[PDB]
Structure 1
Amino acid sequence: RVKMHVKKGDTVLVASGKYKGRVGKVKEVLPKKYAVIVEGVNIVKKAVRVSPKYPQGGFIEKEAPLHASKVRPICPACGKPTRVRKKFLENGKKIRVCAK
């Protein structure tokens, strides 16, 4: 429980290190590790292939899990902290001034 955090799968700004200011959508979020993948961090896995099945398996540069505290959600501006206003039924996150 409570492992949950900032945004889910959507647009986000990177206030990290080697990718500060960068922007992208989050294509995965690993709560078990409190990190998310965007489109930013990319390292070279010279590795032949991960699992013995399939001959070729790639030098893939794929995106490295980014620590969830180095990414802020964003909407009609520069990404604000998340408030939560409950509607007349449910509840959804209003940014520092707008919806969604």
Structure 2
Amino acid sequence: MFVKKGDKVKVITGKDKNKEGVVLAAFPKQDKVIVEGVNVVKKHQKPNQAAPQGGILEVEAPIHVSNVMVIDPSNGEATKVAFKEVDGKKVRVSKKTGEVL
């Protein structure tokens, strides 16, 4: 998975190159994860309890993890995350000159 709920992210593929954001929800069990301002979709909502009207809304849609990097925050780039045996947990450890997340 290598991606948690709150974890900034770069997008590599799919009409949102280079655009970053914050992961909101994590769906493992189908490998989908939704971010902010990357997958805007227009929903023809019908008049409902919520939103008595029927506006055209704009929310985000899931993206497959093969389109998502992780972030440095110590530095600010993308790292093909590796794992290290730091003290008795496995804290993710960046590649590309040794960061610690």
Compute the TM-score of the two structures, normalised by the length of structure 2.
0.82
Secondary structure of the 1:89 match is coil
Match of 1:14 among 11, 16, 23: 11
Q: 1:47 aligns with which of 27, 45, 48?
A: 45
RMSD over equivalenced CA pairs, Å: 1.7
Cα distance change of structure 1 residues 89 and 63 upon mapping to structure 2, 3 Å threshold: same
Asked if structure 2 preserves the Cα contact closer than 8 Å seen for 1:48 and 1:59, the reply is no
The letter of the residue matching 2:78 is G
Query: What does residue 76 of structure 2 align with?
Result: 77
- Is 1:98 equivalent to 2:99 in the alignment? yes
Gaps of 5+ in 2: none
Q: Secondary structure at the match of 1:69?
A: helix
Shift in CA distance, 21/56, structure 1 to aligned 2, threshold 3 Å = same
Structure 1 CA distance for aligned equivalents of residues 82 and 65 of structure 2: 18
Partner of 1:72, secondary structure, is coil
Maintained 8 Å contact 2:24/2:35: yes
Percent pairwise identity: 30
Question: How many correspondences in the alignment?
Answer: 94
For 1:90, the aligned partner's letter is K
2:65 alignment counterpart: 68
1:57: Cα distance to partner?
6.5
Paired letter, 2:61: A
- Partner SS for 2:60: coil
CA distance in 1, matches of 2:22, 2:99: 19
- In 2: Cα distance, 1:57 partner to 1:92 partner: 46
Please identify which structure carries the higher strand content.
2
* DSSP-derived class of the 2:69 partner: strand
